Amino acid sequence: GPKNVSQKDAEFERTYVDEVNSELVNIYTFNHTVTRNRTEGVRVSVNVLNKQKGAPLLFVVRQKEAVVSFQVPLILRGMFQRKYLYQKVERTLCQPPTKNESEIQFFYVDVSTLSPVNTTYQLRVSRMDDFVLRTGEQFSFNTTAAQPQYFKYEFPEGVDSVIVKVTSNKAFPCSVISIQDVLCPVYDLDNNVAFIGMYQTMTKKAAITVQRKDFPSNSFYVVVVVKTEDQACGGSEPVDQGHRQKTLSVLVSQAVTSEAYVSGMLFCLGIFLSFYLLTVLLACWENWRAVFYALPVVQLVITYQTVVNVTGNQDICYYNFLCAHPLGNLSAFNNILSNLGYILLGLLFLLIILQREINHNRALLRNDLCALECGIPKHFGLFYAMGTALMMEGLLSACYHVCPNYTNFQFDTSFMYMIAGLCMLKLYQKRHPDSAYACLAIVIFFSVLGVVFGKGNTAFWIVFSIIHIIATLLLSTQLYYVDRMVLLVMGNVINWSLAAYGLIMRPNDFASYLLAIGICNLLLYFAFYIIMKLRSGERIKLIPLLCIVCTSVVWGFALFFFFQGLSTWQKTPAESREHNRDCILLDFFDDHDIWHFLSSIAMFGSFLVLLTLDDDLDT
Amino acid sequence: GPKNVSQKDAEFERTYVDEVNSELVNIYTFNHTVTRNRTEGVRVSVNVLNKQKGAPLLFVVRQKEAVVSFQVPLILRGMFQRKYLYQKVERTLCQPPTKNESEIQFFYVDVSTLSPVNTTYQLRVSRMDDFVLRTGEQFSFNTTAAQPQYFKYEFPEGVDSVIVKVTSNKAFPCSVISIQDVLCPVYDLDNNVAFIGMYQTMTKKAAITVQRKDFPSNSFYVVVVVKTEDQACGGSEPVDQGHRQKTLSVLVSQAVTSEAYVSGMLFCLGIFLSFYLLTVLLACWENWRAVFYALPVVQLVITYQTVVNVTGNQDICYYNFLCAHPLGNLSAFNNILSNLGYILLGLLFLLIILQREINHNRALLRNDLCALECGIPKHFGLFYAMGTALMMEGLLSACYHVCPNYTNFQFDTSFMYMIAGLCMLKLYQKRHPDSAYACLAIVIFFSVLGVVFGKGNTAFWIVFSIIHIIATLLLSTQLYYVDRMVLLVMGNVINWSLAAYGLIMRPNDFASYLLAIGICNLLLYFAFYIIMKLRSGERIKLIPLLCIVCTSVVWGFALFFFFQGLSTWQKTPAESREHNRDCILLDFFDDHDIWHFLSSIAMFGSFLVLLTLDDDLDT
């Protein structure tokens, strides 16, 4: 007649080799017994042998309630009208749940083409024996840009959230890992995948935190889809592309139940309400025996945070996805407690100055002669800024850590130098009792130029490297005697030891690097201040000296953890996600959160250097 | 046998009514003669009559080089697992260009289902006689969420850019208008549409500017896709949804060729190099006859601008899409020249102060007695700020107008009050020659609270309304005699006339509204300053008075155009795009760009009030 329609009764796990004309159509009738409980996923797999350029095979999979139709050799899209041609196509068949416990279910495969030559294909329908994922058990597979895959997970009895971790041992097939509910169809194509769910482009690691209140089915599909071009991960006639494949590994493990939150917050209070206990008991017994930054920052952040929450495109906020414990609508709630050190110490510092000035004033009322002529003259208008600034660093970082990003970046660390600036100002306002804000603004502007060029050319880096060493020998002679020539020994080597470290690494983060120059230069001056006392008639009581060794150590651990993550921020969040790590402390905090703890203790303990350093000069 | 396969030879523009079992499949063989030049688009259309709940029809359209397969009644997705069921499906068939001038082309339709009851459908394949769009000719059609449509445009001989304008007379089907190249397939589904191209959610208006350098085919497809739920436009068992349809209208018109740019830029220079000409000729003949805002602003903007340029999601930047002439990578280049008034007048102002102070200093060298005791004492450290501030308002608005948005919003107008503040400070520093920055920061913070609540509840508005009238009677008695009680007459009514206007409209924009309070309150004080002179022995020369009438008028036109668009910024850029308008002046500038022109002339002409107002007090 017009055409030829052949109706074979097909079988699972067998390979059929056949031929189709422009005048022949093949229909295969597969059938499987589905069970309500032990769902198994069917998976079709076709492969056209030595196809010419004439006309594709057209494959239709007809279930009871869905039609899925593709054409082999599949042709996929590049950026600039580039085409890729895959000879081998695979697809898992979505199928909805059943009201009966077990029932027989049919589906048909229809193979046809409109080319006048006998095309030979290779059809094999095989059942998946590893569909449903199990909690805490690794699993490996393969996928290409023509053969997307997806697996099922269903939450156990009494697990309210999991974290789907997917890893790969190599870089450049670029996968997308979407997470979708269990209602057919499954959006596992390059165009479909971004439609719904909450995805994550991966290169070596992806981690998605899932909570079963969003899934009334108590289950979800994990969908892995490779991409034709690697531009979104930092890479560089149809072009056959079947030679490019990706091996992966998926592990689903339960998240922290509820105690890591309670035992995490009872750790911040336990070591900062400890200082309040300590100083009060130390002071009591012994004695008688800015807004211009608050406004623009926050309202951008609230706008930016909800975007992912309402879109599920997790390439926006540069969290540490392996340790990011959500609470409410906050996706990294453990990076916000970490900023309790500033809010609880920058305030405690102010209380110290209050009573210090209040205790002082009574001496004038007592008509003390010392208060008028003995000791360095009082100036507590700068201490009230250091105490104020610290409290404002734990508020512009708690707002940065709601979506860390290239845009949001300057908010925290730029204000950090201000704190370091006041320490530099106070020492110079001490010895020479008779401005720098431009330099802090310049540094921010330089970091802004270092923000417009953070991944800037290495030519820019050596420009900064050269300029820094010029400013190294410039400020060297500003404060310049055997002891004086001792200064330039370390004052120039340490800066060399840092600028050189820049070229060896070229951290994509810049402002955070300048912070390293900040302390590493400043911390030297403290010694330069102390060596003045030791090599003169000046002395040190045990109260200030004790606050010198301790704070010189907490600046050691802090600068260690501040270095544990320094390159853990790159372009293309897919690359920046390769560096995430599990939670070190209490399984709630990681390296960075330790830095927010140690920095606030390093700084507060260096304020109480200045406060009591020149307190032996009273008499 | 196993099934029944019927092979009909079908015909165009006829309606076939047939039945299918779980044991019958229909195959229709359509054929059309395609021509290289006059491409016509085929369009299938199926409709299932009184379908039960059992099992869908499955439709496959098999061309020579593509398979398109759906299932009727189509089921579409809501937000929270809501399903919608369409009984009627339509689709235009994509088909690639032909190497022959004209050739016969076949395609098959396959109708089959797996339900055991005779389902009756209604298949009609009809050719489209209005496929290819023509330049400058309106065109109307219809579409639903099951029947997406797309049309073709190909650029004429010598037209380098067009603007696709689509309008609708009603609001709430939410369409998406993508623009894609002419390579099959066409992504005209809810999931596909966002994949590639450059789309725009519409409610009443959409306008996409297209440039044929991005399309080597010299043509593109305009794709219209309705949406099931109206949430993205501000709205509120499967639920049958075929009763909801959208009528549209598409007009493609050529953009400004090249002269609107040259004749636009030769308009900014012609009226600001005019002032330089004017004042120099007026002065010469007659006489002898901050950085803390530059850094955070810009680098966010460059990051934000390229996102649309690399994604084509034009619901991000709140341009005026009907008048937005691109140049380079800037999408609204006519909103950036408009800010040449500040850069060219805030600088000219400084030149005035220079020679004013330079001419002054020689009087002291000449040992003039007047310069020491006659006239109000000189203080040009505040004028050098007003001249500096103006130049910095035409730089934080030229950076805002690269993507206007809720986040980017505060950059320009917040700094505007600073300029108004110095004018208020100068007058009070004049009469009382012996701070407000907190109020400007508070206003920004209040506008920040008005930014966190811009669309805030009307309860918030009346709070501001009540508080403003309290501050109306508060500052009234600060500066308080028949003339003194004249002050409170207008000083309180005008503020009432504004706060009341707020409740009648409740503009979603807030900071811009506060600007209206800014001038409308400030502008009254100028009169309050002038009425002091007129009702005393004080006088006015013709040089200052001339600069009073003129600047009181340019504050009339400016506040007119500043009101022509005040609600033209809402939530959901689909709604905010209903308010766009064509270009008024030179077909390059619109209402807002006139405001950037008149504001800079209104301000500069009010500085030269203060400069020369009290210049009759010399002797």
Ligand SMILES: *[C@@H]1O[C@H](CO)[C@@H](O[C@@H]2O[C@H](CO)[C@@H](O)[C@H](O)[C@H]2NC(C)=O)[C@H](O)[C@H]1NC(C)=O
């Ligand atoms: C369902 O498919 C199976 C194939 O897996 C069919 O079972 C075959 O039946 C034939 C005829 O008796 C025998 O070769 C075997 O019993 C089966 N073949 C196998 C297991 O390879 C079965 O007929 C199909 N069901 C229906 C209703 O057609």
Ligand SMILES: *[C@@H]1O[C@H](CO)[C@@H](O[C@@H]2O[C@H](CO)[C@@H](O)[C@H](O)[C@H]2NC(C)=O)[C@H](O)[C@H]1NC(C)=O
């Ligand atoms: C993924 O693909 C790789 C091939 O790239 C598979 O590795 C092959 O299969 C087994 C397992 O090692 C060996 O017998 C072959 O020699 C392997 N080939 C190579 C080149 O290594 C791997 O098994 C696949 N992963 C699966 C099936 O889970």
Ligand SMILES: *[C@@H]1O[C@H](CO)[C@@H](O[C@@H]2O[C@H](CO)[C@@H](O)[C@H](O)[C@H]2NC(C)=O)[C@H](O)[C@H]1NC(C)=O
């Ligand atoms: C292409 O389709 C057309 C239908 O539009 C077929 O033309 C029909 O041919 C029959 C047989 O002679 C006659 O009824 C008319 O000539 C046509 N019917 C119409 C116009 O309604 C034509 O046969 C098809 N071509 C092929 C090769 O099958």
Ligand SMILES: *[C@@H]1O[C@H](CO)[C@@H](O[C@@H]2O[C@H](CO)[C@@H](O)[C@H](O)[C@H]2NC(C)=O)[C@H](O)[C@H]1NC(C)=O
């Ligand atoms: C879009 O649909 C409307 C119906 O909602 C069509 O209007 C109908 O068709 C013609 C044109 O006015 C009239 O004879 C009918 O009475 C109209 N019905 C109603 C209720 O107004 C309109 O024609 C369609 N647009 C097209 C086909 O371009």
Ligand SMILES: *[C@@H]1O[C@H](CO)[C@@H](O)[C@H](O)[C@H]1NC(C)=O
């Ligand atoms: C296939 O078509 C040919 C026509 O040449 C003829 O043998 C018959 O119609 C069909 N036979 C089979 C086995 O399909």
Ligand SMILES: *[C@@H]1O[C@H](CO)[C@@H](O)[C@H](O)[C@H]1NC(C)=O
């Ligand atoms: C199982 O499914 C069949 C349809 O194949 C249906 O007729 C039957 O009612 C179902 N079982 C029960 C217990 O309802």
Ligand SMILES: *[C@@H]1O[C@H](CO)[C@@H](O)[C@H](O)[C@H]1NC(C)=O
């Ligand atoms: C293959 O093509 C030949 C034409 O040479 C034709 O006779 C034959 O029927 C086709 N199919 C097979 C299975 O040989």
Ligand SMILES: *[C@@H]1O[C@H](CO)[C@@H](O)[C@H](O)[C@H]1NC(C)=O
């Ligand atoms: C349809 O199937 C029936 C079987 O009951 C039989 O008439 C024949 O096989 C087929 N007839 C037609 C016209 O398709």
Ligand SMILES: *[C@@H]1O[C@H](CO)[C@@H](O)[C@H](O)[C@H]1NC(C)=O
């Ligand atoms: C027109 O198309 C046919 C295929 O149907 C092809 O054989 C022929 O070569 C084409 N015409 C020319 C001039 O190449």
Ligand SMILES: *[C@@H]1O[C@H](CO)[C@@H](O)[C@H](O)[C@H]1NC(C)=O
């Ligand atoms: C409709 O269903 C009946 C069963 O009652 C069956 O006999 C018949 O073949 C079906 N088709 C038509 C066209 O009547």
Ligand SMILES: [Zn+2]
């Ligand atoms: Zn931090």
Ligand SMILES: [Zn+2]
């Ligand atoms: Zn503006």
